[PDB]
Design a binder for this molecule. Structure first.
Ligand code: TRH
Ligand code: TRH
Ligand code: NI
Lengths: 196, 195
């Protein structure tokens, strides 16, 4: 228990962003390395992982591999995300609420390694910056991406200084051409109750 | 080269009915890479069985292992979809433990992030690590319980009667539990009632 190994499975809500949850994940170590149940439906529903994730019976698992200082975000595609780390690496995770209402623009940040996971509700922008030499970032989502639909998706620029966030190393961030060109928050229309 | 940019595709394994091997598209750039490791809408048409979702049960496991580590051979009563989540590499190994014409049949192949495998219940799964480290990630459709482990099917990795060859047997690093699994001779073929 505590730093990395042997934590008790547990969940905490994030007060600034309704619907978000942070989980402590049990990681069991031995001579070989380690093992975790990254996601376990039966054990996690009683802790607050939302049953609504399963509404349409859709499932996709993505994995990205990234080097130190790489920054990906901030992206608010129209689906829920369950995010964690799959190797020995570490990221600074960062979130900005894009939903219409009293929490528009609210933020949260925390360090994520293999012993922590995050549930991100649809309408909350996701991003991270790599702290370790490399990292494998693995996530479960409940709708299907298509290239031609990207203009329909919500994004916000990582470097908008008006956002209440602080990156690890903004100056040395390694980003995509796309992430360089996303709009500032002032040009993002708040998202209505799942588009209504 | 043969890591990036593969067409999404599936192939059967002749020796082990129900197994599938997939080529997975991996897209590289200045940051690293990205893959859709599993995508339900795209994979069902290729042969990924709808029955995997019959009960609504879902678990995702990850193990992290160092060079020469060997884990297996394990045939628990659920289906498995397996791949690599980092830049590492393993030798994958399968032994069919099901009652019938294919009992004892085997397959082996190298797995990196650009390949995945569907393993039906009753086929024992294992691997040996070829790279410095590897992250091995899998999706399964029933729930492991410590109390029930004595009832799950296992076969010993080092039984020379198995029609397999490991990368480095003499320097393999295994768990005590894996040292002690039964030899093939002592494993009763698994009936549908057992799975
Ligand atoms: C998101 C996605 C990308 N791709 C492809 C398109 C590109 O060739 C390659 C990389 O795509 P990019 O959009 O540059 O990946 P990215 O890692 O910058 O995008 C991701 O960022 C995270 C912070 C978000 O949470 C994710 O939802 C996603 O937007 O992968 C897919 O095939 N399927 C997908 O679902
Ligand atoms: C399999 C499993 C293990 N554990 C725990 C029990 C131990 O403290 C720790 C390590 O367990 P071990 O049984 O030594 O892990 P292992 O990595 O040797 O076991 C795995 O081997 C693969 C080849 C099989 O395909 C898998 O089904 C599984 O059996 O993880 C879980 O909490 N949940 C699980 O689902
Ligand atoms: Ni609930």
């Amino acid at each position: 228990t505590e730093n990395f190994f042997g934590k008790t499975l547990a969940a905490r809500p994030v007060e600034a962003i309704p619907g978000m949850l942070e989980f402590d994940i049990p990681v069991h170590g031995d001579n070989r390395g380690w093992f975790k149940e990254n996601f376990q439906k039966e054990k996690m529903l009683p802790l607050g992982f939302p049953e609504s994730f399963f509404a349409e019976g859709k499932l996709q698992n993505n994995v990205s591999f990234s080097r130190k200082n790489v920054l990906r975000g901030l992206h608010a595609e129209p689906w829920d995300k369950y995010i964690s780390v799959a190797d020995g690496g570490k990221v600074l995770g960062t979130w900005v609420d894009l939903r219409e209402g009293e929490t528009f623009g609210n933020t949260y940040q925390t360090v994520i390694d293999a012993s922590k996971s995050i549930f991100v509700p649809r309408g909350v922008a996701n991003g991270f910056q790599v702290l370790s030499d490399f990292v494998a970032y693995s996530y479960l989502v409940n709708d299907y991406w298509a290239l031609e639909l990207k203009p329909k998706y919500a994004f916000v620029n990582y470097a908008d200084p008006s956002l209440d966030i602080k990156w690890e190393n903004l100056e040395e961030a390694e980003v995509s051409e796309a992430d360089e060109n996303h709009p500032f928050l002032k040009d993002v229309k708040p998202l209505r109750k799942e588009d209504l």
